[PDB]
Design a protein around this ligand. Structure first.
Ligand SMILES: [Cl-]
Ligand code: NA
Length: 129
C-alpha cells in the first residue's frame, strides 16, 4: 500500500509514534517519505547481503528474519515479510525498539541526512489529526 502523507501521519499517531522517545510526528513521516516514499512494499538490498523492508526500511541484519542474511539477528522477532503489510503495526512496533536502541532516529540514514535539523512540522501541516 502507498500511503498518503496525512493518512500515514494519522496511522502513526494512532500507533503511539507522536513524540515517542521525544520525536515529533513530523520526524516519522519525513523518515517514511525518504526511506520508502510511503510504500509499505519497498525493499532494498544492501552490499553486506542484508535487505531493508517496508515503510521504514528496517534492516534484516539485526531486526527481522528473512532467511537469507547469515549470522543476522532478529531483534524484533518477526519475519521481514510482516514489515511489508498494508497494516503498519509490525513496522511501528519494531521501529519503537530501534529508536530506543541508543542512537535515536540516527539509525535511519535518510532521516539523518534529509530530515534532521529541518522543519519537520511541515510534514503534518494541513492534516486533520
Ligand atoms: Cl534521542
Ligand atoms: Na535477521
Amino acid at each position: 500500500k502507498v500511503f498518503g502523507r496525512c493518512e500515514l501521519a494519522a496511522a502513526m499517531k494512532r500507533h503511539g509514534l507522536d513524540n515517542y522517545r521525544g520525536y515529533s510526528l513530523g520526524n516519522w513521516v519525513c523518515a517514511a517519505k525518504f526511506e520508502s516514499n510511503f510504500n509499505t512494499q519497498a525493499t532494498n538490498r544492501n552490499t553486506d547481503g542484508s535487505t531493508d523492508y517496508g515503510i521504514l526500511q528496517i534492516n534484516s541484519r539485526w531486526w527481522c528474519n528473512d532467511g537469507r542474511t547469515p549470522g543476522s539477528r532478529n531483534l524484533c522477532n518477526i519475519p521481514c515479510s510482516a514489515l511489508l503489510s498494508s497494516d503498519i503495526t509490525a513496522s511501528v512496533n519494531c521501529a519503537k525498539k530501534i529508536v530506543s536502541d541508543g542512537n535515536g532516529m540516527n539509525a535511519w540514514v535518510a532521516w539523518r541526512n534529509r530530515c534532521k535539523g529541518t522543519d519537520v512540522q511541515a510534514w503534518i501541516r494541513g492534516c486533520r489529526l
